[PDB]
């Protein structure tokens, strides 16, 4: 098994909008399958819950490009010295540098500010005299970029460029465009990092700049750039699309929206079912077997690129009964939306804070909130890694 069984690019927007039957037909055949992604990368998909969960945490599957037979491009090579693209001991050292910033209790201190951002965004949206807006434009995009920029020290005029870059690397026009985006962002971050030195800033990037300048063995200039990149990007498309994907799931399932409105203590469980049913990470980041790995008789060679397909894990009926049902009351324990094992999402407390506030705000403030679009007018991103919409037209009384 070297040739792909499927080119997901060829499957078009049908597969972007509703990839589940594809993954499930694969799962019926076996746990691992060669495919060519839309962007043109030949990779393995790992499907099925138990196998997904095990591969995510299995140290046989490195995240370090030194273990990949595909080389990094020059633009990619400027950015790979980050925790998500490292194994221990580098992963361990890098994540210790920021772990305290992202604990549930540290992130709790942002609640007043996150609440204020949401309320301001929601007030402005609610001023449309026709009671129609795009939820993606009004709320889901600007909330997470505001929060993460304040933390990191990205000046407000520089924030809109990240929507552009981050879209380019999710859904590029062509392979060139993703590579150009990366180089542009990378250049920008290097300049931003530079502009911090000697400036006595108190944001997280300023603190990391001093840490690296005081001792480059603790945080190298390449690691300094990779940390800035990963904290910005890793949390970005994900949080934005959690908010919009989840509100889409709630609004397209009126019984569940009604349940939640009648019992707002259902809120945490609802956001967990958003993650399970409509989470933004469709497939996890690249893994590379350090030696050939046998998965029930399918052998993945050492060095090949492996996607763990979280979306299909989440539709495995042995683990999530009646898996196509969006049920805010469901037991979502064991979902893989934030990963599992040493790379488990460091942003999860922050992501949950943002999405819980946002969902509750929309619900309490937008009476008769509803979709303003037939489900088939929506357009989805093709990338097998990220599940995401272009727009989300909504309406309220
Ligand atoms: C709902 C929104 C979010 C989702 C669904 C999400 C999901 C994920 C997933 C699946 C992983 C592991 C990837 C893999 O194992 O291949 C991950 C790791 C990571 N996440 Fe998130 N994340 C979100 C929000 C955030 C935010 C807000 C931040 C930053 C403040 C963030 C920062 C990171 C970082 C730095 C890693 C790498 C951690 C490591 O390698 O140890 N994420 N996330
Ligand atoms: C899970 C977090 C997030 O993924 C990431 O942040 C990826 C690490 C990140 O990819 C890279 O930075 C790769 C750089 N090396 C090639 C050098 C991200 C931009 C991938 C992209 C498809 C995405 O938005 C994917 C976003 C999510 C899947």
In terms of residues, how long is the chain? 397
Cβ-count burial 36-62 (b if 16+ within 10 Å, e if not)? bbbbeeebbbbbbbebbbbbbeeeebb
The answer to whether the CB of 82 falls within 8 A of the CB of 230 is yes
Q: Which residue has its alpha carbon closest to ligand 1 atom 35?
A: 231
Nearest-angstrom CA–CA distance, 304 and 44: 8
| Phi, psi of 319, rounded to the nearest 5 degrees | -105, -40
Structure-block tokens of residue 251: 């609004």
Q: Which residue has its alpha carbon closest to ligand 2 atom 3?
A: 234
CA Rg value for the chain: 21
Structure-block tokens of residue 275: 């993650």
Q: Which atom of ligand 1 is nearest to the CA of 308?
A: 16
Domain limits at 320? 1-397
Q: What is the CATH number of the domain that holds 378?
A: 1.10.630.10
SS3 of 23, please? helix
Q: How many A from CA of 369 to the centre of ligand 1?
A: 30
First to last CA, the chain: 56
Name the domain count of the chain: 1
Residues with CB under 6 A from ligand 2: 72, 76, 79-80, 84-85, 169-170, 233-234, 237-238, 281, 285, 383, 385-386
The answer to whether the CB of 91 falls within 8 A of the CB of 342 is yes
Elucidated via: X-ray
SS3 of 294, please? strand
Residue 187: C-alpha distances to residues 181, 192, 194, 217, 291 (Å)? 10, 9, 11, 23, 35
Determine whether 387 is exposed, middle or buried from the number of CB atoms within 10 Å of its CB (0-12, 13-18, 19+).
buried
Pinpoint the alpha helices (H) of 197-234. Answer: 204-214, 221-233
Pocket residue to mutate for ligand 1, from 147, 152, 238, most atoms within 8 A of Cβ: 238
Residue 70 DSSP symbol: S
Q: How many A from CA of 94 to the centre of ligand 1?
A: 14
Nearest-angstrom CA–CA distance, 20 and 283: 12
Nearest-angstrom CA–CA distance, 355 and 107: 13
Residue 136 DSSP symbol: I
Angle between helices 175-196 and 221-233 (to 10 degrees): 120
Dihedral sign of CA atoms 376, 381, 387, 392 in order: negative
């Amino acid at each position: 098994a070297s040739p792909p069984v499927l080119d997901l690019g060829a499957l078009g927007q049908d597969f972007a909008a509703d990839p589940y039957p594809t993954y499930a037909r694969l799962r019926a055949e076996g746990p691992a399958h060669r495919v060519r992604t839309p962007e043109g990368n030949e990779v393995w998909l790992v499907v099925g819950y138990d196998r997904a969960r095990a591969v995510l945490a299995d140290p046989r599957f490195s995240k370090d490009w030194r273990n990949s037979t595909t080389p990094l491009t020059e633009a990619e090579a400027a950015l790979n010295h980050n925790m998500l693209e490292s194994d221990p001991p580098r992963h361990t050292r890098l994540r210790k540098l920021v772990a305290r910033e992202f604990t549930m209790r540290r992130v709790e201190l942002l609640r007043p500010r996150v609440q204020e951002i949401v309320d301001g965004l929601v007030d402005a949206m609610l001023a449309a005299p026709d009671g129609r807006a795009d939820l993606m434009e009004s709320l889901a995009w600007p909330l997470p970029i505001t929060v993460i920029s304040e933390l990191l020290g990205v000046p407000e005029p520089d924030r809109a460029a990240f929507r552009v870059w981050t879209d380019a690397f999710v859904f590029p026009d062509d392979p060139a465009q993703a590579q150009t985006a990366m180089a542009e962002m990378s250049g920008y971050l290097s300049r931003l990092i530079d502009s911090k030195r000697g400036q006595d800033g108190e944001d997280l990037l300023s603190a990391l700049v001093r840490t690296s300048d005081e001792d480059g063995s603790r945080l190298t200039s390449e690691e300094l750039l990779g940390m800035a990149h990963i904290l910005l990007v890793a949390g970005h498309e994900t949080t934005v699309n959690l908010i919009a994907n989840g509100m889409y799931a709630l609004l397209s399932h009126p019984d569940q929206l009604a349940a939640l409105r009648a019992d707002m203590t259902l809120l945490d469980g609802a956001v967990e079912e958003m993650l399970r049913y409509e989470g933004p990470v469709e497939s996890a980041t690249y893994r590379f077997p350090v030696e050939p790995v046998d998965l029930d008789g399918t052998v993945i060679p050492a060095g090949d690129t492996v996607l763990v397909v979280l979306a299909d894990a989440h539709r495995t009926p042995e683990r999530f009964p009646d898996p196509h049902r969006f049920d805010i009351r469901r037991d979502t324990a064991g979902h893989l939306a934030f990963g599992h094992g040493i790379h488990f999402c460091i942003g999860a407390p922050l992501a949950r804070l943002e999405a819980r506030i946002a969902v509750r705000a929309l619900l309490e403030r937008c009476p008769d909130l509803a979709l303003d679009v037939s489900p088939g007018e929506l357009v989805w991103y093709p990338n097998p890694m990220i599940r995401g919409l272009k727009a989300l037209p909504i309406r309220w009384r």
